[PDB]
Each structure stands twice: as C-alpha cells, then as structure tokens.
Symmetry: C4
Subunit: 389 residues, 4 copies
C-alpha cells in the first residue's frame, strides 16, 4: 500500500534551532541497564523516528565496559530504540551486526547496512525489511567503512558512501546505489575531494547532499552532491573559510573549494552542514583542538563563496562540555511544504578525555530548525563522572 | 477515519469518588529503575489512558537523584506510561524535552507541548502526532510556563494557558488556541483574575473550565472559562469562602469573586475544581500550612456564591501524609450520557519536607466520580523513607 | 466485529493433566524486579491467555517486601502479564486497584473487578474494556470480597459471587450478573450452602459451576450452580466423602450434601473442582493440616454421591512442597468440540511457614486436561529460601 | 488470509557465510537480567525471525544459576526473543514448559513442542497458535526427547523426529507428522542409521533433510530424508570421511554410508549439514576432543561419496573458543528464487569446562550463506569469565 518517498520539497527557512530529542543515557546508565554505545544517529520511518547507534555489547555499569574505547569488535551491533529513551538491553532492537553502519527508510521499508570483519577482510551486509539481501566484500582490504548516520532515498533509490583504504592518504571511496537492498550500481568517487570519511547526508528536491570528513590533510569539509535519479555525483570542499572539521586551524579569510585547507593532518570528526544558498548553516565544535562544544553558524553561500563568514549562530553545547560526532537527518514524512532540517550531536563521555573510568560511551542531543528566532539553551550530557568511580 | 472529539455532554452527578489509578512509584523505585519525576498528570486517548509527568533524567536509586528538588534543567522531559504502572526507564515514552508541559488528544491525534531553555530565553515546542509543528518564544523573558496537566479539545481546537513573567506580581498570561499543533489565535488574559499559574482544565458542553493558582496575593483560586468555538474567555475567582490554595488563611464567611483573598503571598499549589452548580466539588490540601492531606468538598455554587460552604466531602489523603499538585482530567471517549469527573493528586516524597534523602520525587493517586455514595479510604504514597538511607 | 461467547460445548474427557504454564517467579525474583503477589489466577482472551494476581506494590528483593503477609493495603492492585513469564514491574499491566478481584472476557471485551477500602467501608469498581463502568458499596460493612479467580460469561452475561460479612459465621453472599460492566441483577444466595468464600468457576453448555470455600464449619466444599440465561442459581455441598478443603478431617465413608462436614472451623483454602458425572475430578492439598502438596482425584459423581471415592489420580505438587490457593479456568476460544478443563495452583513462599524471610509471595503452576493417560511429574516452586537471607 | 508455506525452491549457491545474528548474552548478563539458557536455535515466522532456547528459570547473576549444568528440571521452558537481543526476563516469551523442544511456523501459525516429566514418565505437549492441541506419552520410558532446533513444514505438514530409549545403545526413534498441531501419522525409524539424536533439519523442493547425532558408536552423522507429502522417510549416514561429530577420530580416507564410523562411543554433539551435491557444506567443531571451535567445510557430494574431502572452508569460531550445539534454519518467507542456508552455533560458557563459576549458559552466533566469496572473521562468545567470580 505504501509508496516510495520522493524528494519533492526544499528545506524550510532556518532561523534558529529547537530541541528535538535528548536521551540522558549516561545519567540514566549510572543506575540502569543502558548499553555502551558510540557513533549514534537519528532516522525516521513514515510513522516513527528512532535513535540509532553502535552498541558495544555490554552495559555501562557492566564489567565488560572496560576497554570500550576500542572501535571494532565482534560484540558491536547497530541498534535502534525509541526517540529520547536511552539505549537499554530491553528497548534496543538490533538492526544488524558490525562496527560501521548506515540505515534509511525508503517509504516502504528500511534498509540497514552493517560492516563486520577483521581490518583486512571486512564485508558489508545489506538488510532490507529486516532480512539480508546483498553483501559487499572489502575492495581495498583496509577497514571497509561507511557513513555512521542515515542514508536518504528517492523513488526507492538509496545512495550510500563507503571508503576502504588508508585513513591518512588516498583511499578508495565508492558511492553505491541500492533499491530494496539490491545493488543497482556503484561508482568510484570523482571530483576534487581528496579524502572522504563518515558522510552526513540529507535530501531535498535538488538532490542528495553529503558533508564528509577529510581525515588526511583537510580541515575544511568535503562535499558529495548526488543525483539519485541519474545515479551520478560530484565532489568538492566547502569553500568558506569558516572551517568545520576538528581539530582545525583558526579561520582564515580565504577558504579552499577544490583542495584541503592545511594545518592539521591525520585526524577529524564526523560532522554535517545544510548547504542552501542564503539558508546555509554549518555545524562545528567550538574548540579548534578537541571534541568540545558545538555551534551552528549561518554562513551564506558557504559551499561556493571562499570569503563567506557567519551572520548568525546558535550555541548547542558549551565549550566546557564534551561533544563528538554530528550528523544530519530529516523527517521526510512530516506534513507541510518544506523539509525541516535536523541534526544530532554525540556527547562522548569517558575515554580518552575522562580516563578515571575505563569505558567510552555517549549520549545524544538532537535539534530541528524553526522559522522563529528562538532563544538558545546549551545541552550537555549531564552525567557526573565521579559517580562511576 | 477518526473524527475530532466534540464536548457534547454534561458532567455526571458526583456523589462520591472511587479509586481509578495508583502507581506506588516510590515504593517500587526503592528496588527498580523508576525515574525521578514531579508535576504528574493523567490524560486519555480514545483507546487508552496514561500517566504523564516531568522526568528528571535519572532513577531514584541512581546517584543523579541528588539535587532533584530543582525544577528546571536540560535533563527533564515529558514522559507518559501505562496507567498505574510506575514510570520506569523501560516503559516511559518521551513526548518532548523540557521542564513545563501540557498534553491532550483531540480525537484524531495527541498534542504535547514542552517548554525548555534558560529563564530569560525559554521556548515552547508544540508536537502533534509525535512531530514538532510550531514553536513559541518567550514574550516576557521570565520562565515561560504552562499548565502541568492536560489540555482539552473541542472540534479540533485545543486551548492552552501560558504565563511568562513574575511569580510574585503582575505577569503576562496568554491563552493559545491550537489545531493540529498550529496556532490559530492567542489572546491576553482578560477578566478579574490578577495572577495565573498552572491551570487545571476540563471540558463539557458548556465550554472549558480552568481552575488555576494565584501565586501573588490570593488564596482563593482564579478561574478561566473558555469558549473553544468563539475562542474567547473570561476570568474571575471562585467566590466561595472555602479557600483552596495552599498555604492559605482559615476559611472566612465571605469569599472574594473578583480579587485575591489576602493573607498569604508569593506561594501556592496547583489544584483544581469541578464547577457545576449544585454538583460543584472543590479539591484542597487538608493543611492550611503545607502540602499535606487532600480532600474533596461539595460546595454548591462555589463559583458564584460568596457565602457557600460544604455539604458533603471525601478524604483522599490523610493530613498525616504528603500530597502535592492536583489536577483534572476526564475520559472524553467513555461511553455513556455524561462525562465522569476525574482527578489526580501528586504524592511528593523527599525534599524539602523529608531531607534525609537528597532527592525529590512523587507517586500518583487518581480518582473518578461515582453516582453511588461509596465508602472512603485514604491513599498515601506508601514508601518508608528510612529504606532509602 | 467480535461476538459474545456462548457456552455451547461440554467438557473434554479428562484422563490426565498436562503442564500448561509455570512462571518460576520466586526463583527469578531472587535477582530480578519481580513484584510480590498472592491470590493468582489465569484467564483467557480470544487471542491470548494471561496470568493474573494481586500485587503488593513492591518487588521481592525490595525492602517494602517486609510485611507482605498482610492481605489488604492501599498498595495492592490486580495485575496481568504474559503466560509463564513472572510478574515484573515491566510486564505487569494493572487492571484495577484493590485487594480482592475477579476478571473475565465476554468475547468482545474484558471485565475486571477490584474491591478496595477499609474493612468497614469497602467498594467494588467494575471495569469493562479498561474503563470504570459501575460501582458497588459494601452491604454488610465487613470486608466485601470476591472470587480471586476468573469469572465466566455466556451471551455477554457474566455472573460473579461476592461475600460481605463474617468469615466465621453467617455472611451475606450475593450473585451479581453483569453485562458490559453494567449490573443487570443481583440476588442473595439460596440453597443449602451455609458459608461461601472465594468461588472458582467454569462454564459449559449446562451452565456455570462454582466450587467455593466454607470458612465457617465445613471441610467439604460448597457448590453454586448458575444459569446465566435465567440469571438464577442453586447451592449445596459436594456430597462425596473425599473432603477437599484445608485444613480438614480425614475422609469418612459418608459425606454431606446439604450441610458442612464438621471437625475444622474458621479456616479453609480457595479450591476448585470439575463436576461432570463420571468425568468428575476434584483438587485438594495432600496434607490435611496445611497448604502443602496438591493432587487431582477422579471421583465419579462426587457432587451427588455421598459414598463416592477416587478411581484415578494425579500428583501435581508433592506434600513436601508448599501449595496455596487453586482455581479453575478454561480457554473458551480454543477450537475443537469440547472445552478443556484447566486449573492453577498458587505455590506460596515465605510467611507464615517460612519465617526466615519477612515477605510472603508465590509462583504459579497450571495444568490442562488430556484425553491421553500421561505420565505425571511434580511441580514445586523451585526457589531456595536460603538465597534470600 | 495466510496460506501454508510450500517448499518450492532449491538452496542458494553457498560461496561463503555472512554474519546474521549474535546476542552477546553472557557479556550482557554479567550486569543485566539475562536468563540462563542452553540448547538454543533460530526460527522464522513470515514477518520476523527470533532466537529460541531452553531457559533454566533463573538469571545468570541470580543465585539459582548454581547447578545449571543439569539438563532436566521443572524450571525449564522453551523461550523465544527478538533476533540478536539476549534472552532476558522481560523479552523472553514462553512457548511451552519443558526440557526438550522444537518449533516451526507453517505459514499460518507456529507449532511448538515441549517435553517434560521424570525420565521414566515424560510427555510431549504440542502447541499450535499458542494453545495446547495434542499430547504424546513416552513410549520407551527413557527420556523422551526431540530435535532442539526448528522443524520444517510443507503444505501444513510439519515432520518432527523424536527418540525415546537408551543414549548408548539401540533406541526407539519415531518420525511424527503434524498439521495444525494434530498428529496425522507417526512411523518408526527405517534405513541404516543405527542411533538418532537431536536432528537438525531444513527443507527445499526435494524434501526435508535432517542431520542428526549418533550418540552410540558413530562419529559420522546419521541423515534422515523425509518426504512430507507421502509422509515417508529413509536414513543413512553421511558417507564422507570428513567426520563431523564431536568427539571423533581423525578423518580417514574412506567413510561409512550405512554404519557408524568407529572410535568414539557414548557421546556426540548436535550438529548439522546442507547436503546438496556440489553445493554441500558440513559444519563441525575444530577440535576432535571437545566442543571448541567451529568451521564450515565445502565437501562435494558428502552424503554419497565415501572418499570426499573439502575444497573450501570458513572458520566460524576459533579452536581457542568454546562452541556447542549447532543447527540449521532458513527464512522460508524471504523473497527471491532460492532458500538461503543459515545456521547457528551455541557458544557454551561455564561448566563443565569453566568450573570456577557454578553455572552453565551460552550465547548465540548465527550465519547465512552468500553467493559472494566474503572475508571471514571469527565469532567468540566474548565474555570474561573472571568477571563472574
Ligand atoms: C537569547 O537567545 C538568542 C537566540 O540564540 C540570543 O541571540 C543570539 O546571540 C548569539 C551570540 O551573540 C548570536 O550568535 C553570534 O552571531 C554572530 C553573527 O551576528 C553578528 O554579526 C552579523 C554579521 O555582521 C557583519 O555582516 C553584516 C551584514 O551581513 C554587517 O551589517 C555587519 O556590519 C558585519 O559586517 C550581524 O548582522 C549581527 O547583527 C544582527 O544580530 C544581532 C544579534 O546577534 C543584533 O543585535 C543586530 O541588531 C542584528 O540584528 C539583525 O539580525 C538578527 C539575526 O542575526 C535578527 O534577529 C534581527 O531582527 C535583525 O534583523 C551580529 O552583529 C556570530 O559572529 C557569532 O559567531 C562568532 O562568535 C562566536 C562566539 O559568540 C564563536 O563561537 C563563533 O565561532 C564565531 O566567532 C568565530 O568565528 C568567526 C568567523 O571566522 C571569527 O571571526 C571569530 O573571531 C571567531 O573565531 C574564533 O573562534 C572560532 C571558534 O572557536 C575558531 O574556530 C576561530 O579559529 C577563532 O579562534 C555568533 O554565532 C546569535 O546569532 C543571536 N541570535 C539572534 C536571533 O539574535 C540572545 O543573546 C539570548 N539572550 C540572552 C539574554 O542570553
Ligand atoms: C464510610 O464512608 C462514608 C463516605 O465517605 C463516610 O461518610 C462521610 O463522612 C465524612 C466525614 O464525616 C463526610 O464529610 C464531611 O461532610 C461535612 C458536610 O456534611 C455535614 O454537613 C451538611 C451540611 O449541613 C448544613 O447544611 C444543611 C443543609 O444543606 C443543614 O441541614 C445543616 O443543618 C447545616 O446547616 C449536612 O447536610 C450533612 O448531613 C448529611 O450527611 C451526614 C453524614 O455526613 C448524615 O449523617 C446526615 O443525616 C445527612 O445525610 C444526608 O446527606 C448525605 C450526604 O451528605 C446522604 O448520603 C444522606 O442519605 C442524607 O441525604 C453533614 O452533617 C463537611 O462539613 C466535612 O468537611 C469539614 O470537616 C472536615 C473534617 O471532617 C474538614 O477537613 C473540612 O475541610 C470541613 O471543615 C473545614 O471547613 C469548614 C468550611 O469552611 C469549616 O466550617 C470547618 O471548621 C473546617 O475548617 C477548618 O479546617 C479546614 C481544613 O483543614 C481549614 O481549611 C479551615 O481554615 C479550618 O481550620 C466533611 O467533608 C462525608 O460527607 C460523608 N459522606 C457520606 C456519603 O455520608 C462514613 O463516615 C464512613 N463510615 C465509617 C464508619 O468510617
Ligand atoms: C507414570 O505416571 C502414571 C500416570 O500418573 C502413574 O500412574 C498413576 O499412579 C497413581 C499413583 O499410584 C494413581 O493415582 C492413585 O489412583 C488411585 C485409584 O486407582 C486405584 O483404585 C481404583 C479404584 O479401585 C476400586 O474401584 C474399582 C472399580 O472402580 C474396583 O475394581 C477396585 O477393586 C476398588 O474397589 C482402581 O480401579 C485402580 O486400578 C487401575 O489403575 C491401576 C494404576 O493406578 C492399574 O494398575 C489397574 O490395572 C487399573 O487400571 C485401569 O485403570 C487405569 C486408570 O485408573 C487405566 O489407565 C488402565 O488402562 C485400566 O483401565 C487403582 O487400583 C487412588 O486411590 C490414589 O489416591 C489415593 O492415594 C494417594 C496416594 O497415592 C492419596 O494422596 C489420595 O488422597 C488417595 O488416598 C487417600 O484418599 C482415599 C479416599 O478417601 C483414602 O481411601 C486413602 O486412605 C487416602 O486417605 C488418606 O490420605 C488423604 C490425603 O492425604 C487424606 O485426605 C485422608 O484423610 C487419609 O489420611 C491415587 O490417586 C494414578 O491413577 C495412576 N494413573 C494411571 C493412568 O495409571 C505411574 O505410576 C507412573 N509410573 C511410574 C513408574 O512412576
Ligand atoms: C580472507 O577471507 C578469506 C575467505 O574466508 C580467506 O580465504 C579462505 O582461507 C581459508 C583458509 O586457508 C580456506 O579454507 C581452507 O580451504 C581448504 C580447501 O581449499 C584448498 O584445497 C582445495 C582443494 O584442493 C584439492 O582439490 C583440487 C580440486 O578440487 C585440486 O586442484 C588440488 O590440487 C587438491 O587436490 C583447493 O582447490 C583450494 O585452492 C583454491 O583456493 C585457494 C584459497 O584457499 C586459492 O589460493 C587457490 O588458487 C584456489 O582458488 C580457487 O578456489 C577458490 C575457492 O576455494 C576461489 O575463491 C578462487 O577464485 C579459485 O577459483 C585450496 O588449496 C581446506 O582444505 C581447509 O580445511 C582444512 O584445513 C583447516 C585449517 O585451515 C582445518 O580446520 C580443516 O578441518 C581442514 O583440514 C582438516 O581436514 C582435512 C580433511 O580430512 C585434513 O586433510 C586435514 O589434515 C585436516 O585434518 C586435521 O584437522 C581436522 C580438524 O581439526 C581433524 O578433524 C582431522 O582429524 C585432522 O586432525 C580450509 O577450509 C578458504 O576456503 C578460503 N576461502 C577463499 C574464498 O579463498 C582468506 O585467507 C582471508 N585473508 C586473509 C589475509 O586472512
Ligand atoms: C553452589 O552450590 C554448592 C553446593 O552444591 C556450594 O558448595 C557452592 O558454594 C555454591 N556456589 C556459590 C557461588 O554459592
Ligand atoms: Ca581533517
Ligand atoms: Ca496563592
Ligand atoms: Ca473450611
Ligand atoms: Ca557420536
């Protein structure tokens, strides 16, 4: 009875951001069976929106939380759970097993992809309506990996960005196009982006826009623009001198559109943007050195204007508080004439920055745009680490 | 397929009150993952009635329960859960994030409103069928706030009372009218009520009646009467000398219809009444000094008769036991020829009255009316505070 | 779309009993949030069968389990939960608040009745499809009380037996007839039963048969036979000298049809029978002194034959193990040409017999009949009380 | 509306195995209410696939976990729970009570069978759509027992293999044929298999193939081939010299088709195979001495070729890690032109191999086939036993 969703609207005008969801997972997990997670995101079905993350296969208070700084193990899985609840043993639904993921609903059913394996022999399994449908073996034998936030579909076609290869040099990035979990096509990355990790994507009538992480030489973010009908793409960098990776140099007065802006090598953080002419907003950590704080900045024409600077902003997380990965999502099934931009911020607690505990986990905060100019709060994780000692 | 509910019945004749629900949350939370809450209420959908409250983002036994006397933080959310279960991490569904709320079902879907932010920059987000639809910024920059119990709808129009401004002097109260989460209209408070907080509302064929709290000078309660078709209102006070705020003076022989009855300033408690001629019943704490005990009193024509006194009553909570906020709700979808009046009482435990623990929480008891003259019990929270030490 | 169920079948031939459900609640509750209960039963809906009991408003490991030998408090409620799971905070659905109950499904919706109040002022609230519909005040001001197992309906009419008055002398027993929760009729007890408590009922094409407890002078069980169409009844005792109350005298050779068989006063236990000519089976504790063991005995024509003795049996619980209340239920919606007799046994743990713990709780075992002659096991609670010390 | 499923497809070509599900139950159960289990399996409904196992009626951290090496007690039950979650008190649905089981969906509803009783008087109860339908008494009075993994249905007919009698000599094996839980037929075992335990079955257009355990003299596995239309069967052994029981001799160069391959008596392990000409894959423990490691081996024509050796393989569990029972299942309702072979491995932890704890439990890993040649990982339980001390 359901039809595939088509991307037929533009973005709503973003004049501020309002609270959407928050799970307080570390606070609650001090005294409840909350799973250790990282790499969270949010994704909507036609009738519900849910939180997602990679479990570590242990609760926070469990003794197996010791060592959860590590990224890849056989005990990780993509889980989903109700919006603004914390991920518990009892409410977390496993989507698939592995240590790197994406997921999206096409209007009829959900596709979830999880990668598992050793570093030199990893494979993706593509699930559609809760069944495995297709599998993809590593092509570069060096940590096949994907977005860590939601994909986006148009008329049943759901593109997904993957990378396999070095994190500190040229790698082999591919864009796959799925329909009902089946591989329609893949293509190698083209354009001027020089390194791609952890793309954060959203869709609108123009196409699908992904803002990624250059882990090699860049502190400006690469952008992949996908046409899901033709199944083709382009890439470049955000031209603006408002640099949005982390760590990063200080903001210059001229950015770089077709190459990495230099100064910080071999590191980064997953992040996102909404690139929409005069309605452009960029997210970034407040700190240039570490994953602390989070702000949204209105930077007109950031994608294309190598002199562009902010004209409005909003603090999301104070610089005194830990942040983490961030990514885009939207509720494509909400009624109205425009798609309301949304995002989440991962609020990382524990190692490496808080090493009196032996675990690493996170909570989630998420916001959506308003056409009002709303007052701002700040949204910390809220747990007192000393309680875990 | 569903239609908006219309208020087409009068109240049933209230000859006594019968037990409806009770969650025993503090008893159970001594040994289970029960969330710390306050400001509870009850609200019905066409097929289910649920408990609601503002979580504090921690369980009672969790170490983060320390400090939960505080009213506003980033860790609060409106939650709902099944009738007479306690609010646990596992059964509590988040309706929205914030520290002041209302919620109601219009017959088709539920509207929930949560306010969040710092005191000088708060904002309401209006959710409808589990999606954000509208946002309202603070207009007086001083703790924008709302009912803390259910709203009521007629033909899709759901009025809600908000206040922004001082709690100890004139403030800016507005009545908003929503349909499908969209703002149809708002108006400033009119009439003779001099201060409005925390309105408790119910609907019937005559219109929507809200009984509120005058926190400034009054120990009689203000009343707002709303016509949800014309989208207009009036206000006054309950005229009766049976005073129903807390703390309060002793009952005189002449009440006040159009001004606060004096003697207690800068305090109050959320409460309620059913104002229906000879079928009028008022709730109040038994104590005139503190939030202890709870009784219902049949006070004919209390709204309009400044000499009216009780002719019948029922003890709900003994004066030896702690009470708290109270509010009205009804199951507008129950079959029959009349709407059965219902209410809840918040049973506050912990601080400030029980300061050997470091938390503040509550449980819920709720009653509905009977046309029988039923025997009365009393309904304490039932937890032994010493067990938490 | 659903129709009321009609009692159109006879009982299946009972040649043995097979295991139906068992929750292991005390074993599991040693280390999980299992509610303290007593007075359990089983009842079916058209699409599911569930366990029921009266919660005590605390978990077993919780400190509020101390004192749960007591029968009546404001913290009790009728709960239901999935067959063979234990009653936990998370899976227990509250049907209504109180300390004596019954419940049954009529084919369209479920009626649940809970009595609450002080001993001299108790009241029943009748819920239908999860809403309160009717209320009944105490008529004798002495612990209004009901079946503690399921009722039975025919063409929408659901009879329920209540008692109010002394437990150690003549009392005021009434049979109420409900439809959609509304009172159609009530009548005073007639016939030769001299005292009635805690009736256990089942239905078949002949009518509704209830086996009760004479707490005053009898150790034979009273029987109430109800015609749910005419809404009339008769009463007598089981004539057989196989005595089935507890405590009780030893079995004589002549029973009593119209008066209590003497020797034990002012005590008893809830129990049951299936009275069906040559297909008659009686349940009883094995011990004549205490609530220990449980057996089923095939006693042809027990109702009417004052010389009848057993011709077959089955041990359910060894005499070395604690038992408790027992009662009848059937899955009236199972396909086939006959109704399969079922029963449960409450396996009481803790006080008064095991007083090294400070609580009283139970688990459940339940059996249904087979037309095979199946091998027998025995079914203890299975918890080691020493683990709770 | 639903129709019975018909076995109309062949197996997909198996070129490797991909991860399907993993529950990490022992890791999570270190700090959560995870039930002690053993004898797990997986089985699909038309709209969901679930994990199954025999509970021990206690959590792992509960004190009643002491003694759970024992196989048969009144506290065991067949439970099911969501794929890749662990079996908790809160998510485990009881299918039936007992200590040996099978279960399968016929396309319309699920049949579950549980055996309970003492060793000399056990009985099976056959449940269909969650109601008991048929019962089978022991025929040899010596531990009536069944598959411990899913059955398979065709056009509503679901065969199930049972054994009653000695585990160390000739026994009485029967194949029962059920439809809607009713016994259509049973027959005694025929063919050249000399002892049958714990059959693991799958279906395809050819019929139903079961790979079993010869506990008496054989270290090759018996095979039962069932025609579910004619309701007849044959039996033999896997002819290949790649021996797949445990413990077992080393692989010779000539296997045995019609008799046990000798060297190890009175022991074995439940296991499985997919027997499909050149697409044949066998599972086995890596160790020849103990239940450690697990591998899949491609052995062309293993069923019929007494010289056949492996031509491809995949490690599932390293020899350094504990394994356990293994069995077959498939998602018969997945779209496509072939049935994708799947299996699970029970990862046993605790006694007897790890006797510093007093319990025995397990977790689950499960895989399905791919037509790609995917990289391999290994999939241990992942718990650190020292944490439980
Ligand atoms: C209640 O809640 C509300 C709502 O949230 C809150 O108001 C909000 O306050 C915040 C904080 O003040 C504000 O965010 C800031 O916005 C700044 C941009 O706005 C200002 O500049 C624009 C542009 O000016 C240029 O261009 C104009 C033409 O376009 C030209 O005319 C100018 O002359 C100039 O050339 C200007 O237009 C703005 O003026 C409007 O807004 C004012 C209010 O902000 C108002 O008073 C004015 O009248 C005017 O009003 C109109 O517009 C508003 C909407 O904007 C409408 O609502 C009105 O109706 C009118 O139409 C402002 O003057 C932005 O620059 C800020 O970001 C910088 O600073 C923050 C710290 O605060 C950093 O974290 C940022 O990263 C950033 O600074 C870094 O980056 C830049 C870029 O490279 C560098 O230059 C900096 O040096 C700095 O770099 C360093 O740090 C970074 C990070 O660590 C590092 O990476 C670097 O390497 C380096 O180390 C900030 O985002 C927000 O917009 C505002 N919202 C609203 C709606 O008002 C209230 O305060 C709350 N109330 C209370 C009591 O609390
Ligand atoms: C089993 O369970 C049942 C059911 O619950 C229970 O019965 C219930 O008992 C309670 C407690 O007794 C009872 O509640 C009280 O009701 C009082 C009102 O009823 C009495 O007065 C009326 C009115 O009399 C005037 O008006 C008449 C004309 O309208 C006139 O004729 C009179 O002469 C007089 O002028 C009177 O009509 C009543 O009489 C009927 O009811 C009697 C039973 O109550 C019965 O015996 C009579 O025959 C007659 O029966 C008819 O009516 C009933 C229904 O009412 C029908 O069922 C019958 O069939 C007949 O038709 C009564 O004489 C009410 O005043 C009480 O409230 C005051 O007291 C409580 C403490 O008890 C306080 O907490 C209250 O706040 C309140 O007192 C404060 O406030 C007032 C007002 O300002 C002050 O004047 C006081 O001084 C006091 O103020 C102080 O304290 C407050 C609070 O701290 C503070 O704020 C102040 O500042 C100050 O410090 C109370 O509500 C209930 O109605 C009754 N229900 C039923 C159905 O009977 C049984 O007892 C239980 N059984 C057992 C064994 O336990
Ligand atoms: C595997 O699992 C199976 C299945 O469960 C199991 O077999 C089962 O074993 C149990 C235990 O032995 C058995 O239960 C007992 O059944 C007794 C009744 O059966 C016997 O008597 C009848 C009637 O005999 C009279 O009437 C006949 C005509 O009707 C007449 O011909 C006789 O001469 C006589 O006058 C008799 O017909 C039976 O014979 C049949 O069954 C035999 C097997 O039991 C078989 O060998 C025979 O060949 C014959 O077979 C036919 O019938 C069976 C079905 O029954 C069919 O299956 C066959 O195909 C044939 O058609 C038996 O001889 C019953 O009396 C027992 O109950 C008393 O004893 C128990 C203790 O065991 C007490 O707890 C009870 O309360 C009760 O005793 C108390 O009460 C009585 C009554 O007042 C007093 O007289 C007593 O003194 C005593 O009172 C004291 O204690 C109480 C309680 O504390 C106290 O309250 C008092 O005050 C006082 O202090 C018992 O129920 C069961 O039926 C049987 N089932 C089957 C299907 O066989 C196997 O053993 C298991 N295998 C293994 C290896 O474990
Ligand atoms: C990334 O991930 C991939 C994917 O998993 C992984 O590659 C995989 O590696 C594993 C491990 O190496 C490999 O599994 C092994 O497979 C062995 C079989 O393959 C080899 O033999 C065949 C058959 O050769 C005979 O027959 C031919 C004709 O049929 C003839 O031409 C020959 O001359 C010969 O007569 C041969 O065809 C294979 O060659 C192909 O594959 C090679 C790669 O494996 C490739 O290099 C070749 O070019 C050729 O490629 C073609 O085929 C592949 C698919 O196979 C296609 O993908 C290509 O495109 C080409 O078309 C191989 O030479 C199998 O024997 C192994 O099992 C034995 O050893 C393991 C230990 O490793 C034991 O645990 C097993 O039990 C077993 O050994 C026991 O049992 C046997 C049988 O009785 C005894 O003889 C042994 O002595 C031993 O017995 C002892 O132990 C047991 C157990 O304890 C005990 O019970 C006994 O009693 C006794 O004590 C093993 O299964 C897997 O297939 C391979 N997969 C793929 C797709 O390549 C990569 O390594 C990973 N990468 C990294 C970097 O990690
Ligand atoms: C388990 O039970 C045995 C008795 O059989 C006892 O010796 C042992 O101490 C128990 N283990 C624990 C951890 O209590
Ligand atoms: Ca970078
Ligand atoms: Ca006041
Ligand atoms: Ca008695
Ligand atoms: Ca063997």
């Amino acid at each position: 009875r359901r039809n595939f969703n088509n991307l037929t609207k533009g973005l709503c005008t973003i004049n501020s951001w309002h609270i959407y969801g928050k799970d307080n997972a570390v606070r609650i997990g001090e005294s409840s069976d909350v799973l250790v997670t990282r790499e969270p995101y949010v994704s909507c079905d036609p009738d519900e929106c849910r939180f997602y993350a990679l479990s570590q296969g242990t609760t926070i208070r469990g003794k197996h939380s010791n060592g959860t700084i590590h990224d890849r193990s056989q005990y990780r899985a993509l889980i989903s759970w109700p919006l603004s609840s914390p991920p518990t043993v009892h409410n977390s639904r496993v989507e698939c097993i592995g240590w790197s993921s994406t997921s999206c609903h096409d209007g009829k059913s959900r596709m979830s992809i999880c990668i598992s394996g050793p570093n030199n022999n990893a494979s993706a399994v593509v699930w559609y309506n809760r069944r495995p449908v297709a599998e993809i073996n590593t092509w570069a034998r060096n940590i096949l990996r994907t977005q860590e936030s939601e994909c986006v579909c148009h008329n049943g076609v759901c593109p997904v960005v993957f990378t396999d290869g070095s994190a500190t040099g040229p790698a082999d990035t591919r864009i796959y196009y799925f329909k009902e979990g089946k591989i329609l096509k893949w293509e190698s990355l083209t354009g001027t982006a020089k390194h791609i990790e952890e793309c954060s994507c959203y869709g609108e009538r123009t196409g699908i826009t992904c803002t990624c992480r250059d882990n090699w030489q860049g502190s400006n973010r690469p952008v992949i623009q996908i046409d899901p009908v033709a199944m083709t793409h382009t890439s470049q960098y955000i031209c603006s001198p408002v640099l949005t990776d982390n760590p990063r140099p200080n903001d210059p007065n001229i950015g770089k559109c077709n190459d990495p802006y230099p100064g910080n090598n071999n590191n980064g953080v997953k992040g996102f943007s909404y690139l929409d002419g005069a309605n452009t907003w960029l997210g970034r950590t407040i700190s240039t050195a570490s994953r602390s704080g989070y702000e949204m900045l209105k930077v007109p024409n950031a994608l294309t204007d190598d002199r562009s600077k902010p004209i409005q902003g909003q603090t999301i997380v104070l610089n005194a508080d830990w942040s983490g990965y961030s990514g885009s999502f939207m509720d494509y099934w909400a009624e109205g004439d425009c798609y309301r931009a949304c995002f989440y911020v991962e609020l990382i607690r524990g190692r490496p920055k808080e090493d009196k505990v032996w675990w690493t986990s996170n909570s989630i905060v998420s916001m959506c745009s308003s056409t009002e100019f709303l007052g701002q709060w700040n949204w910390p994780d809220g747990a007192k680490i000393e309680y875990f000692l």
